[PDB]
Design a protein around this ligand. Structure first.
Ligand SMILES: [Mg+2]
Ligand SMILES: [Mg+2]
Ligand SMILES: [Mg+2]
Ligand SMILES: [Mg+2]
Ligand SMILES: [Mg+2]
Ligand SMILES: [Mg+2]
Ligand SMILES: [Mg+2]
Ligand SMILES: [Mg+2]
Ligand SMILES: [Mg+2]
Ligand SMILES: [Mg+2]
Ligand SMILES: [Mg+2]
Ligand SMILES: [Mg+2]
Ligand SMILES: [Mg+2]
Ligand SMILES: [Mg+2]
Ligand SMILES: [Mg+2]
Ligand SMILES: [Mg+2]
Ligand SMILES: [Mg+2]
Ligand SMILES: [Mg+2]
Ligand SMILES: [Mg+2]
Ligand SMILES: [Mg+2]
Ligand SMILES: [Mg+2]
Ligand SMILES: [Mg+2]
Ligand SMILES: [Mg+2]
Ligand SMILES: [Mg+2]
Ligand SMILES: [Mg+2]
Ligand SMILES: [Mg+2]
Lengths: 214, 113, 121, 117, 54
RNA sequence: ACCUCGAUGUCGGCUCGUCGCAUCCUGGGGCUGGAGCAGGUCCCAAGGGUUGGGCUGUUCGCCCAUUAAAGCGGCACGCGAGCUGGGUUUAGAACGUCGUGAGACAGUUCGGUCUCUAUCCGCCGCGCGCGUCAGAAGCUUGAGGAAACCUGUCCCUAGUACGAGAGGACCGGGACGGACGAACCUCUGGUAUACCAGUUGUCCCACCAGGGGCACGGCUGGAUAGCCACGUUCGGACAGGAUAACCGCUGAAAGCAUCUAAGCGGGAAACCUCUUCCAAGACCAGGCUUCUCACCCUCUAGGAGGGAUAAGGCCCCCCGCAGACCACGGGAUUGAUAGACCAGACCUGGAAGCCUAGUAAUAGGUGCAGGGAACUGGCACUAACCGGCCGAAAACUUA
RNA sequence: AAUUCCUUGUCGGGUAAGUUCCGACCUGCACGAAUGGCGUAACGACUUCUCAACUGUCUCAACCAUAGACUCGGCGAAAU
RNA sequence: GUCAGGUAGAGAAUACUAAGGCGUACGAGUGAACUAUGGUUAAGGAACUCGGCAAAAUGCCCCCGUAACUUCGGGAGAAG
């Protein structure tokens, strides 16, 4: 029902449509994925399928994961993710050891990419939540970038947990919605996703079929 | 090596004549005017050429009706069908941005003899 | 990229030299105004003895901007002087002639008169 | 080489360049220098590039090396002794070692040397 | 700001106990015929004879 | 005048928000002296939005352009250990008045120091120790929480229904926008303190040439990489359940009637799922899997203590677009992790030398030349080391 | 109007918008002729308004280098 | 209070430098937010702000040419 596969953000580039219109696309490496485990409602309680992607040396593979892959009946990989399907009717379409490629998608389809946004370190409020800065002149005394007030004078007492303040941003799970897949290069196992996806170049990403437009 | 070259070569366009910033060129752009695709000629001087492979672009400046107009075009854009370099240019910079304040004789560009 | 309190050269034979934008129509709080956008401006300078005079409040379509404008085919267009053309009540260019060039973005809708009067693009 | 990507080694700008130049001069003059760890780390690429320029030195490279090193005797002895000595080495002419910290400020100290072999 | 009240001994010692040192990882090395303890960071320097050993 | 004169800093504006609906708009409904558009009144509804300027310290208020709107209030007439002081409310001086007078004027004008290294709680992020009943690892259900909810213009329906005419639809679809948020450098731009080219002053390399330090990188024209918006994409859903106002069906009490007394229904941007993220410290401390599942000594055998180990982890080492430290991620001789070298892409623009023309500056051939950093492909040339620490089960009852 | 509570008195000059700015009307709460009345070329780090350029004051914020802030080595206070 | 070089510069200002004196007394690292000192910016150019506050702009030598007013000196280095 809900197709999906793991890949790696290769980079970004441009393409041209049939009407000479420019389209900035993202080249992603939706390399081959191996089905290593299938979650069922009778065994675990939910309908999901476990996929594995990426090359790893058997010496670098850890012993627990090595034994897990041996019991599954496939070779080890770098990354292992899980896609939660809708029901056993959809889970039955997968089998342990099955190999999935970029051919599961078609041109013009709508996907959702999920990755880990880049890390911006300890960023201030103005960069975290777009806080409006203060005047840089007319007397401003060391408040050119400070947040300012925080709450009520003496009635609230506390600071109303949830106030937007400074801290470490980025490096969190982000998910885009309704990205148009421009082209699916089969010989190369590559996807041209219309737009920009989270994460840096060479980072792991999970592409799925869109929910609002699937 | 341009890792994405194996995807950019499919869109790379041939028959692109070799030009440099400062040469006079007239580009032919395919423009659709009310269900009618015609060819519009834009004659100017290449003031800059930013190379990025498939995303390589070039800017052409033209003085029309006493007003300057700068137009940037992707070298590998399919909307273009002809790029004729009329006369070469003898310049020293790579991006002739200083031409945004010269008019007439002061804006004339040398020619590679 | 035109906004409030921005001066624009009038391209028409109405007698106005430069106008000052007041507000960009087409939205609650619009920040900028590109090519093809309508705005409300006042005549800050006019030709001695022209139709319109200084201090009037009129409408004008923002054409021939200075900031780069990106088209649908990846190309860009930019001019060297922020210009504008005073329009009539609903949609019509005040005057009977245009002087400078206009961007192709004017062809969106209802600007056929200006597109035909402009001797370029 | 690659920028420091942060606060420079010696105070403000325009001083790290002279510091690296003096360090490379001392290295090419002696053969073994003892400095701070980050100083040697930043000098490694500088010294390697200077050694490559000396290797390639036929003409227009002597000036490229002199525009960074002032000691004429140091430049000459470099181009002469080192010269083709590393012609068989495809990079990596400098070796870095870590030594104990000095008294006062616990600055991690390193030692840069030239691979003789 | 200034401290409002005197911090109790409990909290004082609890916050002070965190200011401790970390012992370094030593490694046995055979130099000059005798075995000595030198950190792995300076193991190579001691092997080559650049680490002073009192 | 009930705490506060052995101190509670008083009106604005900027930043920052939280909450009530006596609702400005969006949403739903009843009556209309509702023909239609457009209105008047009432009820429910706070999820979201509620513009930019001129005057004036101003709150307030008037005016100019729009928009659906440019809501009313509480939070010490919110917020000065977040920010300025335009005014009030010190000391100086002036104008008009009172006062012989010093002096005074909720009458006016000019100018007039805004201190404090965060102790505790509170808030935004990050670690250490321990627990989840052997020691570890992979993937996740999830209670319980956080984030979003905005809407305009145009075309068809349809110039149709309505209406003498003027004027002009409800409902349902299609297209394009204004604001906000998330991601990113693919395009355009902002910055690039070890990049390129020109040059003024000055000193130096013995001197010409060619070069180096300082004068903001000395100044300009560019500038690969990282970050960013001015730039490029994505979202405000669809649908399901129960409802407020409201509209209802069968129906007596009370032979009629009645939306209710027993049931069945529809019913909104309100509520719960649905969308994005966190989350088993959720002490009911979870679930599916995989690795090791066995070695000694002491106390006087009841448990405990000490040492050495398996899987695994950590330290040390090379690094990152991960980062204040930490922590996370990748590698560690069975390797392309980083530096160097080669090549490519890209930036800069035609390098030094020689020769030629010119008395000279200077120009032309060797030459897409020379120089370079972040991007990419190879190459062990250099450092990831003949190395150290933690780290596995008391038992019992029922079925 | 440095003088006026009514006052943002009324008209006109400028801005699309002007309780500010300039001239006039004169109803002088409570101007007035050596505690000077009326102006004055030049002048003033005095006060107020406008115009041309200019720019990050702002729309709308973004990056670069330093001295602190952050880690390490040593010395080492404070107000309460 | 006295000596006062050289290079360009009107200049004892400004930049470097000769002779001369010093790196002066806590240091090594790390692109955190934020604070202070400087630089840069696509479009608008005071629309921010009580207030052009701060920032930004011209800036020197030789020439052409300089208004209203005036106490005839001045405005004036007007301006351009
Ligand atoms: Mg400041
Ligand atoms: Mg307070
Ligand atoms: Mg190029
Ligand atoms: Mg310097
Ligand atoms: Mg007290
Ligand atoms: Mg007190
Ligand atoms: Mg209500
Ligand atoms: Mg809701
Ligand atoms: Mg304002
Ligand atoms: Mg409020
Ligand atoms: Mg208050
Ligand atoms: Mg007084
Ligand atoms: Mg008296
Ligand atoms: Mg503080
Ligand atoms: Mg004004
Ligand atoms: Mg007056
Ligand atoms: Mg008097
Ligand atoms: Mg007097
Ligand atoms: Mg004086
Ligand atoms: Mg310390
Ligand atoms: Mg910093
Ligand atoms: Mg600017
Ligand atoms: Mg500009
Ligand atoms: Mg103003
Ligand atoms: Mg100033
Ligand atoms: Mg200045």
């Amino acid at each position: 029902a809900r197709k999906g596969i793991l890949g790696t953000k290769l980079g970004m580039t441009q393409v041209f449509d049939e009407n000479n219109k420019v389209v900035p696309v993202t080249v992603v490496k939706a390399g081959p994925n191996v089905v290593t485990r299938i979650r069922t409602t009778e065994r675990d309680g939910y309908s999901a399928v476990q996929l594995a992607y990426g090359e790893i040396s058997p010496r670098k593979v850890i012993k627990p994961v090595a034994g897990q892959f041996a019991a599954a009946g496939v070779n080890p990989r770098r990354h292992v993710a899980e896609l939660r399907l809708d029901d056993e009717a959809a889970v039955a379409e997968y089998e342990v050891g099955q190999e999935l490629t970029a051919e599961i998608f078609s041109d013009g389809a709508y996907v959702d990419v999920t990755g880990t946004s880049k890390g911006k370190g300890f960023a201030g409020t103005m960069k975290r939540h777009g806080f409006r800065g203060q005047g840089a002149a007319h007397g401003a005394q060391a408040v050119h970038r400070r947040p300012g007030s925080i709450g009520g004078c003496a009635t609230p007492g506390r600071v109303f947990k949830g106030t937007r303040m400074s801290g470490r941003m980025g490096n969190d799970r982000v998910t885009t919605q309704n990205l148009k897949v421009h082209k699916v290069d089969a010989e190369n196992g590559v996807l041209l996703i219309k737009g920009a996806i989270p994460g840096r170049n060479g980072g792991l990403v999970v592409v799925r079929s869109a929910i609002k437009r699937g | 090596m341009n890792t994405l070259d194996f995807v950019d070569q499919a869109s790379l366009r041939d028959d692109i004549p070799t030009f440099s910033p400062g040469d006079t060129v007239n580009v032919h752009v395919k423009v659709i005017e009310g269900s009618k695709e015609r060819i519009q000629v834009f004659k100017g001087v290449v003031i800059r050429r930013q190379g990025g492979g498939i995303s390589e672009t070039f800017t052409v400046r033209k003085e029309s009706y006493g007003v300057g107009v700068e137009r940037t075009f992707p070298v590998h854009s399919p909307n273009i069908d002809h790029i004729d370099v009329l006369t070469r240019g003898d310049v020293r910079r790579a991006k002739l941005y200083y031409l945004r304040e010269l008019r007439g004789k002061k804006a004339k560009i040398k020619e590679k003899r | 990229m035109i906004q409030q309190e921005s001066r624009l050269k009038v391209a028409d034979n109405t007698g106005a030299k430069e106008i000052l934008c007041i507000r960009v129509l087409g939205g609650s709080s619009r920040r900028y105004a590109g090519i093809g956008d309508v705005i409300v401006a006042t005549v800050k300078d006019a030709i001695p003895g022209g139709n319109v005079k200084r201090g009037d409040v009129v409408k004008a379509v923002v054409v021939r901007t200075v900031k780069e404008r990106r088209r649908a085919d990846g190309s860009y267009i930019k001019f060297d002087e922020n210009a504008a053309v005073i329009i009539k009540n609903d949609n019509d260019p005040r005057g009977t002639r245009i002087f400078g060039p206009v961007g192709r973005e004017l062809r969106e809708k209802k600007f056929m008169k200006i597109v035909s009067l402009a001797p370029e693009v | 080489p690659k920028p420091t990507k942060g606060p420079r080694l010696g105070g403000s700008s325009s001083h790290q360049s002279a510091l690296l130049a003096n360090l490379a001069t001392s290295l090419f003059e002696h053969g073994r220098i003892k400095t701070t760890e980050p100083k040697a780390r930043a000098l490694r690429p500088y010294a390697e590039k200077l050694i490559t320029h000396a290797k390639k030195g036929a003409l227009h490279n002597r000036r490229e090396v002199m525009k960074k090193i002032r000691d004429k005797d140091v430049v000459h002895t470099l181009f002469a002794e080192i010269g083709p000595f590393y012609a068989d080495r495809n990079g990596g002419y400098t070796r870095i070692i870590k030594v104990e910290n000095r008294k006062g400020d616990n600055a991690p100290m390193a030692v840069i040397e030239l691979v003789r072999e | 700001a200034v401290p409002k009240r005197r911090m109790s001994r409990a909290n004082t010692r609890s916050r002070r106990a965190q200011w401790k040192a970390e012992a370094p990882g030593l490694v046995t090395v055979s130099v000059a015929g005798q075995q000595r303890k030198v950190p792995r960071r300076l193991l190579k320097a001691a092997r080559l004879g650049l680490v002073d050993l009192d």
